[model samples]
Target chain A: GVALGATRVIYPAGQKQEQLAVTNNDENSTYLIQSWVENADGVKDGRFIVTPPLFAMKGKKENTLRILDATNNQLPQDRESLFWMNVKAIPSMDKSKLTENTLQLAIISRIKLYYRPAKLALPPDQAAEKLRFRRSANSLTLINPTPYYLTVTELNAGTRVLENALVPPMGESTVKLPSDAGSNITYRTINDYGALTPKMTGVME
Target chain B: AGSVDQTVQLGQVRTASLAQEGATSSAVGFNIAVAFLGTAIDAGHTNVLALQSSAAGSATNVGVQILDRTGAALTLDGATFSSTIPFQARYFATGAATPGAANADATFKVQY
Candidate 1:
């Protein structure tokens, strides 16, 4: 696996371009990089352009990835829209470093990419007000009240990142909070650009 | 030279108001075809799984929750329930929608 300098990237709505840093931590091998964006249905999202869609990186080096929006205004203007940013790194086949019977796989990493339009209906932290918390028998259900989708990173003491866990606008997702803590939970919300907001402390009413 | 790319959509659920709120449609029950992976329906007389979208406008219609087991407000809830079985979204009318013409329509989809 190669090292990625950034865990997430942001695409400011209405902006012309954004840059993300990528790295290759391999000792000697070079990698070919490919990037793209897609919607939740795995369909290609043509709202943005990833310049130099293809690039090469030498071992122990870093490079920058540029993203340019088409300014088509195809997404919601008042609320944030969510998309997936996929970065795939394929190690070039070097005959000298590989044996006749060897196997290798390309590493494809995906992170949250958000299109945050200017003049959002609500700020990032304030939007949590729309979140309704309810206690089930042994779990906590989080209800999203706003029209903007939020990617939940940490729930209580849950891991590095709640992979593929996204609370849709006006939808609900339940996670088991600490038994001792009850409804009081510490969690983080990922912004439109897939960046984590500050750790938020709150209680489940 | 060619490339390989695979796309996967993240999980997202859609919701609407359950009770009658202004122009929102109010239903007492719901019938839906929900399939979960690698799990069995825990036999129960009442499965309290319903959804309401806070973002849904007053003019929208939301799915209703399970109100009763043997009443007109019945919902699909039972351990014996199988994904292969027929799904009938049954509902009971709580009231009318503030007396207005149906000027708009909406559809909801959830991806896993």
Candidate 2:
């Protein structure tokens, strides 16, 4: 088994690099570990590069990954950007010793990689409370006034529920609502530590 | 260097369209063969436990809570560490809707 030191990585603006810890938990097994960075759309190439992207790990051993900024000045400085840092561990298999069919499984660990800018007007924790809502007959509109990404963990309008809703920094989103939804609405947001804020109550539009 | 009985996989779990306000997503099963590893190494000696990240934030702040197949909270003793570990996730409200995909991460440990 392989373990990561943190569930997510935060790359602050102007930082030279960020380090992530990888450890092999199995005392008797060796694994080939591979790592890479991808954008929100899952594209492989990005502004960051992972050093020693591929390596081998012996049991009870540990390694560090250096996430370096590659031309990251081109990224937006106004808000935080999100990416995925994927770590895949493949068990070492013996081909000659195989006398029959062997089924081997590899585990890939994916975590969020955030690029935080140098200075932003609003703190991330405060951003969740700033979200505005607008309601129509069959839809609900969410407006994000902050420069941070808002993850709506839970949302409900009376008895109507909105599934998987997120708002980008300084942007808005419209979701379909059940016609029977009531005027009272409540929602929650995820903070920088991946925790949810207090439930916020509001009215549609 | 020793024989490979079973290997561990690490990464993020992402759920789509999780309804806010204590709504749960569908049960998503991982094809991970935890049983094979346990049987090969030491039968009845291995157990998988859900762990919190060392980073900041509590389970309540994470908003997305990873639950067992029965929708019960995953605890060290309460969870079933068997051949395959199936899990479901529910959203814990705390944020506004933002653009792009927003998610939290969880970690699991296999104790031998």
Q: Highest TM-score among the candidates is held by which one?
A: 2
Instruction: Please count the clashing residue pairs in each candidate, in the order shown.
Output: 4, 26
Q: Report candidate 1's interface RMSD in Å.
A: 16.1
Global lDDT for candidate 1? 0.53
* Candidate 2 regions with alpha-carbon error over 4 angstroms: A94-103, A202-205, B1-112
User: Model 1 over residues B27-109: C-alpha lDDT tens digits?
Assistant: 22323323222111123312322222223122123223233234332224232223212222222123332111112111222
Q: List the residue pairs that clash in candidate 1.
A: A114-A192, B16-B53, B31-B89, B43-B79
Deviation from native of the Cα of residue A201 in model 2, angstroms: 1.9
DockQ, in order, for the candidates? Answer: 0.01, 0.03
lDDT of 2 by residue, B1-112 (tens): 1322332232332222222433343434432211111111112212222223333333321234445555554432323443344555434333232212223444444544
Tell me the tens digit of each residue's lDDT in model 1 across A1-205.
4554445555677788887777776767888999888876767887777877898887788677788887588777765677777889998876875656767789888876667778766655566545666766566777787766766766663322223347776677877544454435566775533334557764555
